[PDB]
Design a protein around this ligand. Structure first.
Ligand SMILES: O=c1ccn([C@@H]2O[C@H](COP(=O)(O)OP(=O)(O)O[C@H]3O[C@H](CO)[C@@H](O)[C@H](O)[C@H]3F)[C@@H](O)[C@H]2O)c(=O)[nH]1
Ligand SMILES: [K+]
Length: 447
């Protein structure tokens, strides 16, 4: 039996899709083991609830890097200090990884993009290593093209626009949409980490990508041809698996409710929430709003919008909501897992990128896929300063445009097209089904 070990970084947005990939492999009679840490194991245990996914717990050296003992997850490492400590900590997992690989000798290692050294670690035992990023072909390409060509240095002001080189679409961006650790005050740590991450894509056996060919064929090709990567598109992997707010939505018109949610880990301050609430009231749209009370809500808000607006404070069933008939739009931060869920439900999106690769995802959604509307946020930042809050006016304009604005029904039509393409890609005979079959056969044949 083939054995593949999966090693995601301790972040919810990488762990859940990695589990789905493990399940996809398992359903093909492949032995799948996921490496995690003790305080993160509960995520996998809950989502396991079918072939057996095995877990292996590594000790996370929080004390050695000066982190609180309870900080085993990227989401809890808030601030440059804590984040650099977190990445030093995860780099220190290399010894446990090499011990586990020597002990078990699996046929393949699928390792998170944040572990470039994992390539060499697997090479010590002649094991091929695959990179998993968890984002779109487009972001992979655009990030690599920006790193290589640095078109942000041909610019005089923060909002001066430049095109992305080589791309078959003209994509205009400003250096505000890039991290200041690249264009303003160059800090060698992040630059080196990025260099090594992007290099691992060519030094390794190849890249697994959570996308489907028909979604972004130009960039599925660009990644392989112009950028030289060996890759397999096997997404959306969440389709492998396939209530109060639902009963609420049942009595609503089809495609009439806006869903607002900013991802698994939301760092969101009271002034921003207050602007969102005011914009929601002014827009008149029915809505489900997922929040992490007079400190951020207008007086009488929840009662003044009762029956029309619903605030969810806990973990929301995002997929069940998005695919309910009543939901017509999605205000999102453009994380790739949420973006892909919006696409798979066929739901247009208001794009509100914050950090990471989300501005590239926003360009993919708005300019290329033509299923979204920008809210107007254009400043890359880990934490939000009060000086950067998006005001209620832009939010209301975007909420209006996404529901009844120009092309809204066409966006719905395009998204339903993408929805059918997504479901077809993963069914037997589909592009993603076939690429997964091909990857597994190649792994069987290795040496
Ligand atoms: O109330 C809730 C709130 C969330 N969820 C689920 O959590 C997921 C949110 O994923 P999303 O990509 O938007 O945020 P996150 O995964 O942290 O993004 C990082 O990881 C991504 C993957 O690399 C990356 O693209 C991104 O830039 C990073 F920020 C998504 O699968 C939802 O279904 C829910 O079910 N109920
Ligand atoms: K090249």
């Amino acid at each position: 039996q083939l054995h593949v070990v999966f090693f995601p970084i301790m972040a919810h947005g990488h762990m859940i899709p990695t589990l789905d990939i493990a399940r996809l492999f398992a359903a093909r009679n492949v032995r799948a083991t996921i490496i995690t840490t003790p305080l993160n194991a509960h995520t996998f245990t809950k989502a396991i609830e079918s072939p057996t996914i095995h877990l292996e717990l590594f000790k996370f050296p929080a004390q050695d890097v000066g982190l609180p003992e309870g900080c085993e997850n990227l989401e809890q490492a808030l601030g440059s200090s804590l984040i650099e400590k977190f990445f030093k900590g995860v780099g220190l997992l290399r010894e446990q990884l090499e011990a586990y690989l020597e002990k078990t000798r699996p046929n393949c290692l699928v390792a998170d993009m944040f572990f470039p050294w994992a390539t060499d670690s697997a090479a010590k035992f002649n094991i091929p290593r695959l990179v998993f990023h968890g984002t779109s072909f487009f972001s992979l390409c655009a990030l690599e093209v920006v790193r290589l060509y640095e078109p942000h240095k041909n610019v005089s002001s923060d909002e001066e626009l430049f095109s992305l080189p080589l791309f078959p679409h003209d994509i205009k961006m400003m250096r505000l949409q890039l991290p200041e650790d690249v264009w303003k005050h160059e800090k060698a740590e992040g630059k080196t980490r990025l260099k090594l991450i992007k290099e691992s894509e060519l030094k390794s056996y190849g890249v697994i990508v959570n996308s489907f060919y028909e979604l972004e064929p130009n960039y599925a090709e660009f990644f392989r041809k112009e950028l030289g990567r060996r890759a397999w598109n096997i997404g959306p992997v969440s389709l492998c698996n396939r209530h109060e707010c639902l009963k609420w939505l049942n009595s609503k018109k089809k495609n009439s409710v806006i869903y607002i949610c900013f991802g698994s880990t939301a760092h969101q301050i009271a002034p921003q929430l207050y602007e969102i609430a005011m914009a929601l009231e002014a827009s008149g749209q029915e809505f489900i709003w997922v929040v992490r009370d007079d400190s951020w809500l207008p007086r009488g808000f929840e009662q003044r919008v009762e029956g029309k607006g619903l605030i969810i404070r806990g973990w929301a069933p995002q997929v069940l909501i998005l695919e309910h008939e009543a939901i017509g739009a999605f205000v999102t931060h453009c994380g790739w897992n949420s973006t892909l869920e919006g696409i798979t439900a066929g739901v247009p999106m208001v794009t509100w990128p914050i950090f990471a690769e989300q501005f590239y995802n926003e360009k993919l959604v708005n300019q290329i896929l033509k299923i979204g509307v920008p809210v107007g946020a254009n400043k890359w930042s880990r934490e939000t300063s009060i000086e950067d809050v998006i005001k209620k006016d832009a939010i209301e304009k975007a909420l209006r445009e996404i529901m009844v604005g120009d092309e809204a029904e066409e966006r719905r039509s395009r998204a339903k097209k993408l929805k059918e393409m997504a479901w077809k890609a993963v069914e037997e005979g589909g592009s993603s089904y076939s690429d997964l079959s091909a990857l597994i056969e190649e792994l069987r044949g290795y040496h």
